[PDB]
Amino acid sequence: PRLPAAPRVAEVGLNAPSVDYPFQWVVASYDGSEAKNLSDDLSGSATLTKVMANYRHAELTSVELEVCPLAAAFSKPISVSAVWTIASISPASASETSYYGGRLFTVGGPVLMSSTTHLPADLTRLNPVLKGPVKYTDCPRFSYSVYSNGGTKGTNLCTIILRGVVRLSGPSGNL
Amino acid sequence: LPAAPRVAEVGLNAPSVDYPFQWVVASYDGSEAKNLSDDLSGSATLTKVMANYRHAELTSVELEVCPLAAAFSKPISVSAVWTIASISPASASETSYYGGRLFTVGGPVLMSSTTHLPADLTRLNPVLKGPVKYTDCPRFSYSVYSNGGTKGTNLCTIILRGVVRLSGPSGNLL
Amino acid sequence: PRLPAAPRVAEVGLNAPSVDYPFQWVVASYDGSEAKNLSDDLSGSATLTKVMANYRHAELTSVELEVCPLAAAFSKPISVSAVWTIASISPASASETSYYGGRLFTVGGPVLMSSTTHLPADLTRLNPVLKGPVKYTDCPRFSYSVYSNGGTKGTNLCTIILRGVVRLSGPSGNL
Amino acid sequence: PAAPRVAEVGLNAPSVDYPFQWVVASYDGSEAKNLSDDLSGSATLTKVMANYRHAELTSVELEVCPLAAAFSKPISVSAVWTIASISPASASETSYYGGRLFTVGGPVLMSSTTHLPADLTRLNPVLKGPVKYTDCPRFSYSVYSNGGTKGTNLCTIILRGVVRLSGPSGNLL
Amino acid sequence: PRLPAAPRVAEVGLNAPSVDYPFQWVVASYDGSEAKNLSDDLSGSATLTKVMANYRHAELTSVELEVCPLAAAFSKPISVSAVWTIASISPASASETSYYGGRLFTVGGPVLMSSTTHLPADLTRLNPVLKGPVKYTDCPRFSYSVYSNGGTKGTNLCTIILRGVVRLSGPSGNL
Amino acid sequence: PAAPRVAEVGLNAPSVDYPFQWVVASYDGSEAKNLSDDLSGSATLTKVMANYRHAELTSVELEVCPLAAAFSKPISVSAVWTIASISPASASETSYYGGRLFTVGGPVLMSSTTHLPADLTRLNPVLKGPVKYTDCPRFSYSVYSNGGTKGTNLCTIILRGVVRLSGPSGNLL
């Protein structure tokens, strides 16, 4: 799904020295005990905020949400509906298939490893910049919902992890 | 489908914006067989989207029968067809019309693009709203066969997504 | 009678495979018992509708109304006034000579066969298309009236029959 | 061009401009009265357009002419020109773009601002044709409840404009 | 399987206006209650006969027999043996694997959708013409047999449907 | 150019002009009522702009339409279009440039001078964008205390204009 292009701000510079910072952290681990929703804006992510707390500029080069199955999900698949939107749009709970590009993955079964449940962000349409001189309103936001399937409260059927690369530029001299 | 003659539209350079849309039609469990045939020109969600524009023509539409986790151990069968708005298929008889498909979603293969049915806008009519009321507008008709559902499992879900080009906004109520 | 030209819709295509379908059916048989009127739009004619019920496009190439006399009309001619109009205009009963091109035929007498009582349709001015993507409002409509001349209720002085050719294109896959 | 339109070949036909004007209705303040009409099938205009195959609006406007009886009692009517597809409800004509609320009468019977002209660049000028267009002009107006005397008729609504008629048909004389 | 070429009649014309008529109808629905055989010649198929009842010429351009599985066949596959022969050859019941090109499909199991159970007709070797000036004896004939696997008389394990395209030419003026 | 603006690359995107009109509020003379709203986050316009990423005003105006009940009792409202940064206080709308004092009703309900159009050459036309602009149009009007009957609603404030919407987003259908 390719969203139509929209006018965007122009940023001069982009020639300052900068380092690509690869980050990855498990978003959460989910079972089938209850349906659980989580929507997060990458501008205000706590771990990502503390990654770029000392730099003036920080823009994403790639980011993707990974729905990794576990062994306990071999005989009990679990369903997760996920979407990447702009920060302005805030999807509701369990209603991420109503937004264009929202996909409903089902992890488990005989195929315990597959790249069909990793949802990437189309940074050409979203806003790569997370921290800058001005606060942007169309930064990527990931919203997902996990449907209950009678889990036993501890098996942790699936794990949602988020990884990517953020380019950090222009450190500010504060301590 | 064989070609048919069609009317012509003059101004294709009018300011138009491509409007991607997606909305879940309904979630079905195999407790009872359920039919649904809808013309895209009169579907409630699409028409509340495009009631504010004078012209609205599709670029690509595709109905999707996405399996859920509960359908892993209990597949469900749906027969679907994309036809002309003049033709209204009956219940459970979507295989009697040319191009009708009989999808069966579920099982260990929980994800596959083989159950995605796209509309043939080359032969159908992309235009849903315009100066005239066409009769070749696409109609999607599907029937879900009962297989012993639990009335709460929601084995499958029906997702209709695509792109509609809207042009000439109207001074409507909102 | 040649009506002045009026602007008409433009239809692209017309290159799809199509078959000329020759049709002919007796419209009715009339005697002099009572004056009888009949006006019919060729778009909604039942026999013609079932001819083109499986095709997307159906346009006339020629059509004419034939007032054929019978033997019983040899010594008792009968009068029929007929007109071809657009579907918007609906002639009244026995008032088809007030519309431009309406003609009053008298069939019978020593000349029992003549082509002067066959009224053709000027499809250059009317709309040849009967079935298409859009419903047209100026398709041919034939309106005629039969005047009573003291018939004996069963002799069937004249027979009105309609024949023509309709080109059918773009079959639709329905059964 | 705001929106695409259906192609019409052979538009260079002999056509005549036909100015028309007719009073829509006279309204008093006894009760609120709504009226919405599509110019495609207006009863008192089709008689003008019955003799021709093509009718295309060049200009059209809705006029709210006050009467002298409205001097001591103003009357308010809300009107809008819209697409024939859109059918505004009663007293909701100010919620659509171009919808006005003409109040007439009052101390001075001179305000010539009661004209409500149709924006044919955002509408479909064609009223009659081979097909039945769905975006022809439609006028919708609602008259609010004044303290009317049930007989005064202290407001007048009229329609005037120009329609270009082409391709006459062999109709009744 | 490609049958060797055989001499065939020559037909002049083939330039008359003609429309491709796409047809599709479910042949039947079968379960495992009992073994059921069906052999049908496409020249005399009732639905196909009424499709081309008003045309002088009608020749196939493509046709295939589809063995579509159902949900109830997920845990209970069903076996169908099918063959396309000439109208002269009439296969017996449950003996379609003895004829060259006869294939034994098994529909069901974890793979509920596959194009390996759709058997097409080699119209280069068979006779595309179904209706013409003369009656041909080598028109396509489809013969299939469904083996019983202890079905419960109502589950309808599989559905056999037949779809194709027939070109219709030279309508005859009859009503 | 009155003042510098933020650069916006890729402005040649497919855009559609979206005329909008909605009645702001109906006011009686019972008590003085102030209302100042920024078009960047107006509740009844964001629903139009929620489905698109960029929204740029082409024209906008504030209209004070009198009602018939104002014939015998005029009502005065002071309004101004200003920078969203500036937030004029109550009854101080005539102290800013372009602030008008529309009095409506009176002997004649015909004065069409109640239009207050925004000067977009001195403002920021953009209502929605990647950033949150601080100089978008903001309309501020205060209605003074008449001798109202607390139910008459003898004045109406409406907003109409055109917004160019570009870059639709995959929002709800």
Numbering used by the authors:
A (entry chain B), C (entry chain B), E (entry chain B): 21 to 195
B (entry chain C): 23 to 196
D (entry chain A), F (entry chain A): 24 to 196
Which sentences did the original study use to describe this structure?
CSDaV is a positive-sense, single-stranded RNA virus that belongs to the genus Marafivirus in the family Tymoviridae and has a monopartite genome of about 6.8 Kb. In brief, CSDaV encodes for three quasi-equivalent CPs that share amino acid (aa) sequences at the C-terminus but differ from each other at the N-terminus. The whole capsid models of the two types of particles are almost indistinguishable and reveals a T = 3 icosahedral symmetry that gives particles with a diameter of about 30 nm. Each subunit of the asymmetric unit has typical Jelly Roll folds which consist of eight antiparallel beta sheets.
Besides the expression of free/non-fused heterologous proteins, we also demonstrated that the CSDaV infectious clone can be modified to incorporate heterologous protein into assembled virion capsids, just as it has been demonstrated for other plant virus-based vectors. This was demonstrated by fusing the GFP coding sequence to that for CPp21 in the full-length CSDaV infectious clone to generate the construct CS-GFPdupCS, referring to the fact that the GFP-coding sequence was inserted between two identical protease cleavage sites (CS) in frame with CPp21. When western blot analysis (using antibodies against both the GFP and CPp21 proteins) was performed on partially purified virions from the CS-GFPdupCS-infiltrated leaves, the free/cleaved GFP was not detected, but both fused GFP-CPp21 and free CPp21 proteins remained detectable, suggesting that the GFP-CPp21 fusion protein was incorporated into the CS-GFPdupCS-derived virions. Transmission electron microscopy (TEM) of the purified virions confirmed the production/assembly of ∼ 30 nm icosahedral virions that resemble WT-CSDaV virions. However, northern blot analysis indicated that CS-GFPdupCS virions likely encapsidate the recombinant sgRNA (∼ 1.5 Kb) but not the recombinant genomic RNA (∼ 7.5 Kb), while WT-CSDaV virions show encapsidation of both genomic (∼ 6.8 Kb) and subgenomic RNAs (∼ 0.8 Kb). However, in this experiment, only approximately 22.5% of the screened CS-GFPdupCS particles were gold-labelled, indicating that the GFP-CPp21 fusion protein may not be abundantly incorporated into all of the particles and/or the GFP is not always displayed on the outside of the particles’ surface. In attempts to reveal where (if in the inside or outside) GFP is displayed on the GFP-recombinant CSDaV virions (CS-GFPdupCS), we have determined the cryo-EM structures of both the WT- and the CS-GFPdupCS-derived virions. In total, 175,869 and 12,732 particles were used for structure reconstruction of WT and CS-GFPdupCS virions, respectively, yielding density maps at a resolution of 3.1 Å for WT and 3.4 Å for CS-GFPdupCS virus.
